[PDB]
């Protein structure tokens, strides 16, 4: 299909944050910390929660998001992970569950998943999440190459019905164990 880049549902560096500390077109809450080249959605502190989400709802029949992120921590084991979502919760989340690691599609029940280590990788991890003709597909570049087009399949759910309008967002959290959860970019495309 035709892809149209949708700026109002997207963020990226190298001038990600405005002078007043805000990300254009997105709200942030909790412990999320914007910076010029990434948003630290939850830092490596105990018991953190942070989120960033689009101020506008999108009403795209079909769409694709490309999210580039790092999850970094001192442990061979970390927590808790991050979630990429589309929600009116009512919608769908793609949960990167560190504490495994696995990547899980959850609708609102866990519908499908893959085992994939997305922590402490030499390059940013990239997730391409596509909603096209009621199929939700998750492709992952697991951070071992800098080729933006080098994805491996993770999981897919056919016959998925999600809200006709919704916000895009990212959430992250930590517990007793704590990684830095950084999102470098979130790029949204409408598909026709």
């Amino acid at each position: 299909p035709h892809r149209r880049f949708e700026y109002k549902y997207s963020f990226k560096g190298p001038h990600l944050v405005q002078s007043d500390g805000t990300v254009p077109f997105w709200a942030h809450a909790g412990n999320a910390i914007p910076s010029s080249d990434q948003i630290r959605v939850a830092p490596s502190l105990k018991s953190q929660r942070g989120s960033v989400w689009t101020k506008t709802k999108a009403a795209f029949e079909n769409w694709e998001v490309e999210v580039t992120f790092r999850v970094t921590g001192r442990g061979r084991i970390g927590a808790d992970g991050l979630a990429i979502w589309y929600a009116e919760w009512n919608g769908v989340g793609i949960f990167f569950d560190s504490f495994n690691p696995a990547i899980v599609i959850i609708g609102n029940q866990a519908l499908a998943s893959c085992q994939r280590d997305f922590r402490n990788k030499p390059y940013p991890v990239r997730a391409k999440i596509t909603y096209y003709q009621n199929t939700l597909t998750v492709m992952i570049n697991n951070g071992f190459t800098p080729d933006k087009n080098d994805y491996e399949f993770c999981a897919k759910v056919e016959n998925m019905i999600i809200p006709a309008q919704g916000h895009f967002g990212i959430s992250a959290a930590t517990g007793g164990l704590a990684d830095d959860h950084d999102v470098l970019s979130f790029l949204t495309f409408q598909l026709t």
């Binding site: 035709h2 892809r3 149209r4 880049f5 949708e6 700026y7 109002k8 997207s10 963020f11 990226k12 560096g13 190298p14 001038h15 405005q18 002078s19 007043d20 254009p24 077109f25 101020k55 495309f189």
Partner: protein, 63 residues
């Protein structure tokens, strides 16, 4: 003059892909309210994004 035009096209092409998107335009435009920013960006895209891909290419910029 053509050099100037290309210089100014590339000025805010921060990712280097030879396409200007609305986030790059947001940096070019900029404290202004978000709705004013949206109005300006949406204006540029309406004026100039002839193939409706969400990008201004050099042909679309130069017009």
């Amino acid at each position: 003059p053509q050099e100037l035009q290309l210089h100014y096209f590339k000025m805010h092409d921060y990712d280097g892909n030879n396409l200007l998107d609305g986030l790059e335009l947001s940096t070019a435009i900029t404290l202004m309210s978000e709705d004013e920013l949206i109005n300006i960006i949406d204006g540029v895209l309406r004026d100039d994004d002839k193939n409706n891909d969400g990008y201004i290419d050099y042909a679309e910029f130069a017009k």
